[PDB]
Protein backbone atom coordinates (compact mmCIF):
# COMPACT_ATOMS: atom_id res chain seq x y z
CA UNK A 454 0.00 0.00 0.00
CA UNK A 455 3.11 2.09 -0.28
CA UNK A 456 3.70 0.21 -3.59
CA UNK A 457 0.51 -0.19 -5.72
CA UNK A 458 0.41 -3.27 -8.01
CA UNK A 459 -1.54 -4.09 -11.20
CA UNK A 460 -1.75 -6.56 -14.10
CA UNK A 461 -2.29 -4.99 -17.56
CA UNK A 462 -3.01 -7.33 -20.54
CA UNK A 463 -1.90 -5.12 -23.49
CA UNK A 464 -3.38 -5.79 -27.00
CA UNK A 465 -0.41 -4.93 -29.24
CA UNK A 466 -1.09 -4.34 -32.96
CA UNK A 467 2.55 -4.73 -33.99
CA UNK A 468 5.34 -2.29 -34.77
CA UNK A 469 4.85 -3.26 -38.49
CA UNK A 470 3.65 -1.63 -41.78
CA UNK A 471 0.14 -2.82 -42.69
CA UNK A 472 -3.64 -2.83 -42.26
CA UNK A 473 -4.61 -2.70 -38.56
CA UNK A 474 -7.26 -5.46 -39.14
CA UNK A 475 -4.68 -8.13 -40.22
CA UNK A 476 -2.38 -7.89 -37.17
CA UNK A 477 -5.34 -7.62 -34.83
CA UNK A 478 -6.95 -10.47 -36.93
CA UNK A 479 -5.91 -13.03 -34.25
CA UNK A 480 -7.50 -10.61 -31.64
CA UNK A 481 -10.72 -10.06 -33.72
CA UNK A 482 -11.57 -13.79 -33.95
CA UNK A 483 -10.16 -14.42 -30.38
CA UNK A 484 -11.13 -11.44 -28.07
CA UNK A 485 -10.30 -12.23 -24.40
CA UNK A 486 -7.09 -14.36 -24.31
CA UNK A 487 -4.00 -15.28 -22.21
CA UNK A 488 -2.55 -16.48 -25.58
CA UNK A 489 -2.94 -14.94 -29.07
CA UNK A 490 -0.27 -13.19 -31.17
CA UNK A 491 -1.44 -9.82 -29.70
CA UNK A 492 -1.34 -10.70 -25.92
CA UNK A 493 1.22 -8.93 -23.71
CA UNK A 494 1.03 -9.50 -19.94
CA UNK A 495 2.41 -6.61 -17.94
CA UNK A 496 2.83 -6.39 -14.14
CA UNK A 497 3.42 -2.85 -12.86
CA UNK A 498 4.56 -1.51 -9.46
CA UNK A 499 4.31 2.21 -8.54
CA UNK A 500 5.61 4.00 -5.35
CA UNK A 501 7.10 7.37 -6.48
CA UNK A 502 8.11 8.75 -9.91
CA UNK A 503 11.62 8.21 -8.40
CA UNK A 504 10.72 4.53 -7.75
CA UNK A 505 8.47 2.60 -10.20
CA UNK A 506 8.73 -0.74 -12.11
CA UNK A 507 7.00 -2.73 -14.90
CA UNK A 508 7.61 -6.32 -16.17
CA UNK A 509 6.55 -8.69 -19.06
CA UNK A 510 10.19 -11.95 -22.88
CA UNK A 511 10.96 -11.31 -19.14
CA UNK A 512 11.76 -7.62 -19.75
CA UNK A 513 11.66 -5.19 -16.76
CA UNK A 514 11.15 -1.51 -17.75
CA UNK A 515 10.46 1.75 -15.85
CA UNK A 516 6.81 2.82 -15.67
CA UNK A 517 7.67 5.87 -17.92
CA UNK A 518 9.13 3.48 -20.56
CA UNK A 519 5.98 1.27 -20.56
CA UNK A 520 3.60 4.28 -20.45
CA UNK A 521 5.39 6.04 -23.37
CA UNK A 522 5.08 2.82 -25.34
CA UNK A 523 1.39 2.37 -24.37
CA UNK A 524 0.27 5.95 -25.15
CA UNK A 525 2.40 6.07 -28.37
CA UNK A 526 0.89 2.75 -29.61
CA UNK A 527 -2.68 3.79 -28.53
CA UNK A 528 -2.38 6.96 -30.67
CA UNK A 529 -0.78 5.12 -33.70
CA UNK A 530 -3.48 2.34 -33.65
CA UNK A 531 -6.30 4.94 -33.32
CA UNK A 532 -5.10 6.69 -36.53
CA UNK A 533 -4.52 3.33 -38.33
CA UNK A 534 -8.13 2.25 -37.30
CA UNK A 535 -9.64 5.62 -38.34
CA UNK A 536 -8.07 5.48 -41.86
CA UNK A 537 -9.29 1.88 -42.26
CA UNK A 538 -12.82 2.67 -41.00
CA UNK A 539 -13.09 5.86 -43.19
CA UNK A 540 -14.77 3.72 -45.93
CA UNK A 541 -16.95 2.28 -43.06
CA UNK A 542 -18.15 5.96 -42.62
CA UNK A 543 -25.46 1.43 -44.08
CA UNK A 544 -27.10 -1.83 -45.36
CA UNK A 545 -25.22 -5.05 -46.46
CA UNK A 546 -24.71 -8.92 -46.33
CA UNK A 547 -22.40 -9.78 -43.30
CA UNK A 548 -19.92 -7.05 -44.50
CA UNK A 549 -16.08 -7.05 -44.05
CA UNK A 550 -16.61 -3.32 -43.17
CA UNK A 551 -19.05 -4.58 -40.49
CA UNK A 552 -16.51 -7.15 -39.20
CA UNK A 553 -13.80 -4.34 -39.05
CA UNK A 554 -16.29 -2.29 -37.07
CA UNK A 555 -17.08 -5.14 -34.64
CA UNK A 556 -13.34 -5.61 -33.97
CA UNK A 557 -12.78 -1.83 -33.48
CA UNK A 558 -15.57 -1.67 -30.83
CA UNK A 559 -14.05 -4.74 -29.12
CA UNK A 560 -10.58 -3.09 -29.42
CA UNK A 561 -11.80 0.26 -27.90
CA UNK A 562 -13.27 -1.75 -24.95
CA UNK A 563 -9.95 -3.66 -24.58
CA UNK A 564 -8.02 -0.31 -24.57
CA UNK A 565 -10.38 1.13 -21.90
CA UNK A 566 -9.68 -1.99 -19.75
CA UNK A 567 -5.90 -1.49 -20.31
CA UNK A 568 -6.24 2.21 -19.33
CA UNK A 569 -8.36 1.56 -16.17
CA UNK A 570 -5.89 -1.18 -15.04
CA UNK A 571 -3.01 1.38 -15.51
CA UNK A 572 -5.07 3.89 -13.46
CA UNK A 573 -5.33 1.39 -10.50
CA UNK A 574 -1.66 2.25 -9.79
CA UNK A 575 -2.89 5.69 -8.62
CA UNK A 576 -4.82 6.01 -5.27
CA UNK A 577 -6.72 9.27 -6.06
CA UNK A 578 -7.77 11.29 -9.17
CA UNK A 579 -6.77 14.58 -7.35
CA UNK A 580 -3.09 13.36 -7.32
CA UNK A 581 -2.14 11.51 -10.54
CA UNK A 582 1.16 13.08 -11.87
CA UNK A 583 0.84 15.75 -14.66
CA UNK A 584 3.48 13.64 -16.50
CA UNK A 585 0.84 10.78 -17.05
CA UNK A 586 -2.34 12.85 -17.25
CA UNK A 587 -1.56 15.43 -19.97
CA UNK A 588 -4.07 17.75 -21.70
CA UNK A 589 -4.82 17.76 -25.48
CA UNK A 590 -2.13 20.35 -26.35
CA UNK A 591 0.52 18.69 -24.17
CA UNK A 592 -0.15 15.13 -25.36
CA UNK A 593 -0.23 16.17 -29.06
CA UNK A 594 3.06 18.15 -28.61
CA UNK A 595 4.80 15.33 -26.62
CA UNK A 596 3.89 12.59 -29.16
CA UNK A 597 4.08 14.69 -32.38
CA UNK A 598 7.28 13.09 -33.83
CA UNK A 599 6.70 9.54 -32.44
CA UNK A 600 3.20 9.09 -33.92
CA UNK A 601 3.68 11.22 -37.11
CA UNK A 602 6.75 9.06 -38.11
CA UNK A 603 4.56 6.01 -38.84
CA UNK A 604 2.38 7.83 -41.40
CA UNK A 605 2.62 9.36 -44.82
CA UNK A 606 0.70 12.73 -44.41
CA UNK A 607 1.14 12.09 -40.66
CA UNK A 608 1.19 15.83 -39.73
CA UNK A 609 -2.35 16.25 -41.22
CA UNK A 610 -3.88 13.11 -39.56
CA UNK A 611 -2.41 14.28 -36.18
CA UNK A 612 -3.93 17.77 -36.64
CA UNK A 613 -7.27 16.16 -37.61
CA UNK A 614 -7.20 14.04 -34.40
CA UNK A 615 -6.27 17.07 -32.23
CA UNK A 616 -9.16 19.22 -33.69
CA UNK A 617 -11.60 16.31 -33.17
CA UNK A 618 -10.56 15.97 -29.49
CA UNK A 619 -10.81 19.79 -29.17
CA UNK A 620 -14.43 19.55 -30.57
CA UNK A 621 -15.48 16.78 -28.24
CA UNK A 622 -15.16 18.05 -24.73
CA UNK A 623 -9.40 17.39 -18.91
CA UNK A 624 -6.83 14.68 -19.71
CA UNK A 625 -6.39 13.96 -23.44
CA UNK A 626 -6.73 10.15 -23.02
CA UNK A 627 -10.32 10.44 -21.55
CA UNK A 628 -11.29 12.82 -24.41
CA UNK A 629 -9.64 10.31 -26.85
CA UNK A 630 -11.66 7.44 -25.32
CA UNK A 631 -14.87 9.51 -25.71
CA UNK A 632 -13.92 10.13 -29.38
CA UNK A 633 -13.11 6.34 -29.98
CA UNK A 634 -16.36 5.19 -28.26
CA UNK A 635 -18.29 7.67 -30.50
CA UNK A 636 -16.43 6.47 -33.72
CA UNK A 637 -17.47 2.86 -32.81
CA UNK A 638 -21.08 4.02 -32.18
CA UNK A 639 -21.32 5.83 -35.61
CA UNK A 640 -19.53 2.92 -37.32
CA UNK A 641 -21.80 0.16 -35.85
CA UNK A 642 -25.03 2.14 -36.55
CA UNK A 643 -23.96 2.81 -40.20
CA UNK A 644 -23.09 -0.94 -40.64
CA UNK A 645 -24.83 -3.43 -38.16
CA UNK B 646 21.02 44.39 -32.67
CA UNK B 647 20.36 40.66 -31.70
CA UNK B 648 18.39 38.05 -29.69
CA UNK B 649 20.32 34.91 -28.86
CA UNK B 650 18.73 31.85 -27.20
CA UNK B 651 20.51 28.91 -25.58
CA UNK B 652 18.99 25.64 -24.37
CA UNK B 653 20.91 22.79 -22.70
CA UNK B 654 19.01 19.56 -22.28
CA UNK B 655 20.47 16.97 -19.92
CA UNK B 656 19.01 13.50 -20.54
CA UNK B 657 19.56 10.98 -17.68
CA UNK B 658 17.56 8.48 -19.80
CA UNK B 659 15.06 8.85 -22.73
CA UNK B 660 12.14 9.83 -20.47
CA UNK B 661 13.73 12.30 -18.01
CA UNK B 662 15.31 15.64 -18.98
CA UNK B 663 16.58 18.67 -17.14
CA UNK B 664 16.48 21.89 -19.13
CA UNK B 665 18.74 24.87 -18.51
CA UNK B 666 18.73 27.87 -20.79
CA UNK B 667 18.76 31.62 -21.30
CA UNK B 668 18.33 34.44 -23.79
CA UNK B 669 20.01 37.79 -24.30
CA UNK B 670 19.34 41.02 -26.20
CA UNK B 671 22.86 42.10 -27.29
CA UNK B 672 25.04 41.14 -24.28
CA UNK B 673 22.19 41.72 -21.75
CA UNK B 674 20.66 38.63 -20.09
CA UNK B 675 16.88 38.83 -20.51
CA UNK B 676 15.45 35.35 -19.99
CA UNK B 677 16.15 32.18 -18.05
CA UNK B 678 14.72 28.71 -18.40
CA UNK B 679 15.18 25.86 -15.92
CA UNK B 680 13.55 22.68 -14.66
CA UNK B 681 12.57 19.05 -15.30
CA UNK B 682 10.55 18.16 -18.39
CA UNK B 683 7.26 18.38 -16.68
CA UNK B 684 7.88 21.53 -14.63
CA UNK B 685 10.09 23.82 -16.70
CA UNK B 686 10.12 27.41 -15.47
CA UNK B 687 10.45 30.15 -18.07
CA UNK B 688 11.09 33.76 -16.98
CA UNK B 689 11.66 37.20 -18.49
CA UNK B 690 13.96 38.92 -16.00
CA UNK B 691 12.48 42.31 -17.00
CA UNK B 692 8.79 42.93 -17.97
CA UNK B 693 9.64 43.31 -21.72
CA UNK B 694 6.37 41.71 -22.83
CA UNK B 695 3.06 42.56 -21.16
CA UNK B 696 1.22 39.68 -19.30
CA UNK B 697 -0.95 38.48 -22.26
CA UNK B 698 1.93 38.50 -24.79
CA UNK B 699 4.35 36.79 -22.38
CA UNK B 700 1.78 34.06 -21.58
CA UNK B 701 1.48 33.37 -25.34
CA UNK B 702 5.28 33.21 -25.77
CA UNK B 703 5.62 30.87 -22.73
CA UNK B 704 2.93 28.63 -24.23
CA UNK B 705 4.92 28.39 -27.47
CA UNK B 706 8.14 27.64 -25.62
CA UNK B 707 6.49 24.95 -23.48
CA UNK B 708 5.02 23.32 -26.63
CA UNK B 709 8.47 23.43 -28.14
CA UNK B 710 9.97 21.65 -25.09
CA UNK B 711 7.44 18.82 -25.25
CA UNK B 712 8.01 18.36 -29.01
CA UNK B 713 11.79 18.53 -28.71
CA UNK B 714 11.76 15.85 -25.98
CA UNK B 715 9.48 13.76 -28.24
CA UNK B 716 11.96 13.94 -31.12
CA UNK B 717 14.84 12.77 -28.87
CA UNK B 718 12.67 9.89 -27.59
CA UNK B 719 11.84 8.98 -31.25
CA UNK B 720 15.52 8.91 -32.34
CA UNK B 721 16.30 6.67 -29.37
CA UNK B 722 13.31 4.35 -30.06
CA UNK B 723 14.26 4.05 -33.72
CA UNK B 724 18.07 4.17 -33.79
CA UNK B 725 19.28 3.85 -30.13
CA UNK B 726 21.00 6.69 -28.26
CA UNK B 727 23.70 6.25 -25.57
CA UNK B 728 22.57 7.78 -22.22
CA UNK B 729 23.31 10.07 -20.30
CA UNK B 730 23.59 12.70 -22.99
CA UNK B 731 23.43 16.42 -23.37
CA UNK B 732 21.97 18.40 -26.28
CA UNK B 733 22.64 22.08 -26.86
CA UNK B 734 20.51 24.32 -29.05
CA UNK B 735 21.92 27.73 -29.91
CA UNK B 736 19.70 29.96 -31.99
CA UNK B 737 18.77 33.55 -32.73
CA UNK B 738 18.41 36.50 -35.05
CA UNK B 739 20.80 39.38 -35.81
CA UNK B 740 19.78 42.60 -37.52
CA UNK B 741 22.54 44.30 -39.53
CA UNK B 742 22.57 48.16 -39.41
CA UNK B 743 22.20 48.97 -43.18
CA UNK B 744 21.40 45.34 -44.05
CA UNK B 745 17.99 44.31 -45.41
CA UNK B 746 17.87 40.59 -44.33
CA UNK B 747 18.40 39.59 -40.70
CA UNK B 748 20.96 36.79 -40.16
CA UNK B 749 19.38 33.76 -38.41
CA UNK B 750 20.66 30.42 -37.04
CA UNK B 751 19.74 27.28 -35.11
CA UNK B 752 22.66 24.96 -34.25
CA UNK B 753 22.40 21.65 -32.37
CA UNK B 754 25.28 19.91 -30.54
CA UNK B 755 25.25 16.49 -28.81
CA UNK B 756 27.69 15.71 -25.94
CA UNK B 757 29.66 18.89 -26.83
CA UNK B 758 30.09 18.01 -30.53
CA UNK B 759 28.42 19.79 -33.54
CA UNK B 760 25.54 17.68 -34.86
CA UNK B 761 22.98 19.41 -37.10
CA UNK B 762 22.04 22.98 -38.00
CA UNK B 763 19.32 24.88 -39.82
CA UNK B 764 19.74 26.46 -43.19
CA UNK B 765 17.05 29.18 -43.58
CA UNK B 766 17.45 29.71 -47.38
CA UNK B 767 15.53 26.55 -48.31
CA UNK B 768 14.41 25.88 -44.70
CA UNK B 769 16.38 22.63 -44.45
CA UNK B 770 18.51 20.97 -41.80
CA UNK B 771 22.05 19.74 -42.56
CA UNK B 772 24.65 17.69 -40.70
CA UNK B 773 27.54 19.53 -39.01
CA UNK B 774 29.09 16.01 -38.17
CA UNK B 775 25.85 7.90 -39.09
CA UNK B 776 22.42 6.18 -38.60
CA UNK B 777 21.40 8.60 -35.87
CA UNK B 778 22.32 11.70 -37.90
CA UNK B 779 20.58 10.46 -41.03
CA UNK B 780 17.38 9.57 -39.17
CA UNK B 781 17.33 12.88 -37.24
CA UNK B 782 17.74 14.86 -40.49
CA UNK B 783 15.03 12.80 -42.25
CA UNK B 784 12.62 13.74 -39.44
CA UNK B 785 13.55 17.45 -39.20
CA UNK B 786 13.30 17.85 -43.01
CA UNK B 787 9.94 16.03 -43.22
CA UNK B 788 7.54 18.45 -41.58
CA UNK B 789 6.23 22.00 -42.04
CA UNK B 790 6.62 22.53 -38.26
CA UNK B 791 10.39 21.84 -38.16
CA UNK B 792 11.05 23.67 -41.49
CA UNK B 793 8.74 26.59 -42.37
CA UNK B 794 7.22 27.36 -38.94
CA UNK B 795 10.76 27.25 -37.49
CA UNK B 796 12.05 29.64 -40.19
CA UNK B 797 9.14 32.01 -39.43
CA UNK B 798 9.98 31.93 -35.72
CA UNK B 799 13.58 32.97 -36.51
CA UNK B 800 12.98 35.46 -39.36
CA UNK B 801 9.67 36.93 -38.27
CA UNK B 802 8.92 36.43 -34.54
CA UNK B 803 12.53 36.81 -33.37
CA UNK B 804 13.25 39.82 -35.61
CA UNK B 805 10.07 41.68 -34.52
CA UNK B 806 11.01 41.02 -30.86
CA UNK B 807 14.44 42.64 -31.41
CA UNK B 808 12.87 45.64 -33.21
CA UNK B 809 10.29 46.14 -30.44
CA UNK B 810 12.37 45.52 -27.26
CA UNK B 811 15.73 47.11 -28.18
CA UNK B 812 14.45 50.07 -30.33
Ligand SMILES: CCCCCCCCCCCCCCCCCCCC(=O)O[C@H](COC(=O)CCCCCCCCCCCCCC)COP(=O)(O)OCCN
Pocket residue numbers: 650651652666667668676677678702705706709712713716717720726732734736753755777781790791792794795798802803806
Ligand atom coordinates in the same frame (compact mmCIF):
# COMPACT_ATOMS: atom_id res chain seq x y z
C1 LIG C 1 8.52 36.78 -29.20
C2 LIG C 1 9.84 36.07 -29.23
C3 LIG C 1 9.76 34.64 -28.73
C4 LIG C 1 10.86 34.27 -27.75
C5 LIG C 1 10.41 34.25 -26.30
C6 LIG C 1 11.42 34.83 -25.33
C7 LIG C 1 11.91 33.85 -24.29
C8 LIG C 1 13.31 33.32 -24.55
C9 LIG C 1 13.70 32.14 -23.68
C10 LIG C 1 14.88 31.34 -24.22
C11 LIG C 1 14.82 29.86 -23.90
C12 LIG C 1 14.10 29.02 -24.95
C13 LIG C 1 15.02 28.31 -25.92
C14 LIG C 1 14.30 27.44 -26.94
C15 LIG C 1 14.10 28.11 -28.29
C16 LIG C 1 13.07 27.43 -29.17
C17 LIG C 1 11.96 28.35 -29.63
C18 LIG C 1 10.71 27.63 -30.10
C19 LIG C 1 10.33 27.96 -31.55
C20 LIG C 1 8.89 28.34 -31.72
O1 LIG C 1 8.28 29.07 -30.99
O2 LIG C 1 8.38 27.79 -32.84
C21 LIG C 1 7.21 26.92 -32.71
C22 LIG C 1 7.48 25.65 -33.48
O3 LIG C 1 8.68 25.02 -32.99
C23 LIG C 1 9.23 24.06 -33.74
O4 LIG C 1 9.74 24.26 -34.81
C24 LIG C 1 9.13 22.72 -33.07
C25 LIG C 1 10.13 21.68 -33.58
C26 LIG C 1 11.22 21.36 -32.58
C27 LIG C 1 12.50 20.84 -33.21
C28 LIG C 1 13.72 21.70 -32.94
C29 LIG C 1 15.03 21.09 -33.40
C30 LIG C 1 15.89 20.54 -32.28
C31 LIG C 1 15.96 19.03 -32.23
C32 LIG C 1 17.37 18.47 -32.26
C33 LIG C 1 17.58 17.27 -31.35
C34 LIG C 1 18.32 16.12 -32.00
C35 LIG C 1 18.41 14.87 -31.14
C36 LIG C 1 18.75 13.61 -31.91
C37 LIG C 1 19.89 12.83 -31.30
C38 LIG C 1 6.01 27.65 -33.27
O5 LIG C 1 5.83 28.95 -32.67
P1 LIG C 1 4.34 29.49 -32.34
O6 LIG C 1 3.40 28.49 -31.78
O7 LIG C 1 4.68 30.68 -31.44
O8 LIG C 1 3.89 30.24 -33.67
C39 LIG C 1 2.57 30.84 -33.81
C40 LIG C 1 2.53 31.53 -35.19
N1 LIG C 1 1.38 31.02 -35.93
Ligand SMILES: *[C@@H]1O[C@H](CO)[C@@H](O[C@@H]2O[C@H](CO)[C@@H](O[C@H]3O[C@H](CO)[C@@H](O)[C@H](O)[C@@H]3O)[C@H](O)[C@H]2NC(C)=O)[C@H](O)[C@H]1NC(C)=O
Pocket residue numbers: 726727728729730731755756
Ligand atom coordinates in the same frame (compact mmCIF):
# COMPACT_ATOMS: atom_id res chain seq x y z
C1 LIG D 1 27.51 11.22 -23.78
O1 LIG D 1 28.44 11.21 -22.69
C2 LIG D 1 28.13 10.25 -21.66
C3 LIG D 1 29.07 10.54 -20.51
O2 LIG D 1 28.65 9.91 -19.30
C4 LIG D 1 28.24 8.84 -22.23
O3 LIG D 1 27.92 7.83 -21.26
C5 LIG D 1 28.92 6.91 -20.81
O4 LIG D 1 29.28 5.90 -21.79
C6 LIG D 1 28.67 4.60 -21.75
C7 LIG D 1 27.42 4.63 -22.61
O5 LIG D 1 27.71 4.33 -23.97
C8 LIG D 1 28.43 4.08 -20.33
O6 LIG D 1 28.73 2.68 -20.24
C9 LIG D 1 29.90 2.18 -19.55
O7 LIG D 1 29.64 1.90 -18.17
C10 LIG D 1 28.79 0.77 -17.92
C11 LIG D 1 28.50 0.76 -16.44
O8 LIG D 1 27.83 1.96 -16.03
C12 LIG D 1 29.48 -0.49 -18.42
O9 LIG D 1 28.67 -1.64 -18.16
C13 LIG D 1 29.75 -0.37 -19.92
O10 LIG D 1 30.50 -1.49 -20.38
C14 LIG D 1 30.47 0.93 -20.28
O11 LIG D 1 31.87 0.81 -20.03
C15 LIG D 1 29.07 4.98 -19.27
O12 LIG D 1 28.75 4.51 -17.96
C16 LIG D 1 28.56 6.41 -19.42
N1 LIG D 1 29.10 7.26 -18.37
C17 LIG D 1 28.44 7.56 -17.25
C18 LIG D 1 29.13 8.50 -16.31
O13 LIG D 1 27.33 7.10 -17.00
C19 LIG D 1 27.28 8.67 -23.40
O14 LIG D 1 27.56 7.43 -24.05
C20 LIG D 1 27.39 9.82 -24.40
N2 LIG D 1 26.28 9.79 -25.34
C21 LIG D 1 26.35 10.18 -26.63
C22 LIG D 1 25.13 9.93 -27.45
O15 LIG D 1 27.36 10.72 -27.09
Ligand SMILES: *[C@@H]1O[C@H](CO)[C@@H](O[C@@H]2O[C@H](CO)[C@@H](O)[C@H](O)[C@H]2NC(C)=O)[C@H](O)[C@H]1NC(C)=O
Pocket residue numbers: 609789793
Ligand atom coordinates in the same frame (compact mmCIF):
# COMPACT_ATOMS: atom_id res chain seq x y z
C1 LIG E 1 2.87 22.87 -45.60
O1 LIG E 1 3.93 23.54 -46.33
C2 LIG E 1 3.60 24.34 -47.49
C3 LIG E 1 4.86 25.10 -47.86
O2 LIG E 1 5.87 24.24 -48.36
C4 LIG E 1 2.40 25.23 -47.17
O3 LIG E 1 2.13 26.22 -48.16
C5 LIG E 1 2.45 27.64 -47.95
O4 LIG E 1 3.81 27.97 -48.28
C6 LIG E 1 4.48 28.90 -47.42
C7 LIG E 1 5.96 28.77 -47.72
O5 LIG E 1 6.23 29.01 -49.09
C8 LIG E 1 4.12 28.62 -45.96
O6 LIG E 1 4.95 29.35 -45.06
C9 LIG E 1 2.65 28.97 -45.72
O7 LIG E 1 2.29 28.67 -44.38
C10 LIG E 1 1.75 28.23 -46.71
N1 LIG E 1 0.71 29.13 -47.21
C11 LIG E 1 -0.56 29.14 -46.77
C12 LIG E 1 -1.49 30.08 -47.48
O8 LIG E 1 -0.94 28.44 -45.84
C13 LIG E 1 1.21 24.31 -46.94
O9 LIG E 1 0.00 25.05 -46.80
C14 LIG E 1 1.45 23.45 -45.70
N2 LIG E 1 0.41 22.44 -45.56
C15 LIG E 1 -0.11 22.06 -44.37
C16 LIG E 1 -1.26 21.10 -44.44
O10 LIG E 1 0.33 22.47 -43.30
Ligand SMILES: *[C@@H]1O[C@H](CO)[C@@H](O)[C@H](O)[C@H]1NC(C)=O
Pocket residue numbers: 651653665666667669674
Ligand atom coordinates in the same frame (compact mmCIF):
# COMPACT_ATOMS: atom_id res chain seq x y z
C1 LIG F 1 23.39 30.65 -20.28
O1 LIG F 1 23.45 29.30 -19.78
C2 LIG F 1 24.72 28.63 -19.87
C3 LIG F 1 24.54 27.26 -19.25
O2 LIG F 1 23.17 26.98 -18.95
C4 LIG F 1 25.80 29.45 -19.17
O3 LIG F 1 27.08 28.82 -19.27
C5 LIG F 1 25.82 30.86 -19.74
O4 LIG F 1 26.83 31.63 -19.09
C6 LIG F 1 24.45 31.51 -19.57
N1 LIG F 1 24.47 32.90 -19.98
C7 LIG F 1 24.62 33.94 -19.13
C8 LIG F 1 24.58 35.30 -19.75
O5 LIG F 1 24.78 33.79 -17.92
Ligand SMILES: *[C@@H]1O[C@H](CO)[C@@H](O)[C@H](O)[C@H]1NC(C)=O
Pocket residue numbers: 679680681684685686
Ligand atom coordinates in the same frame (compact mmCIF):
# COMPACT_ATOMS: atom_id res chain seq x y z
C1 LIG G 1 9.30 23.79 -10.83
O1 LIG G 1 10.73 23.75 -10.80
C2 LIG G 1 11.39 24.78 -10.04
C3 LIG G 1 12.87 24.50 -10.17
O2 LIG G 1 13.23 24.22 -11.52
C4 LIG G 1 10.89 24.76 -8.60
O3 LIG G 1 11.45 25.87 -7.90
C5 LIG G 1 9.37 24.83 -8.57
O4 LIG G 1 8.92 24.75 -7.22
C6 LIG G 1 8.75 23.70 -9.40
N1 LIG G 1 7.30 23.83 -9.44
C7 LIG G 1 6.46 23.08 -8.70
C8 LIG G 1 5.02 23.11 -9.13
O5 LIG G 1 6.84 22.42 -7.74
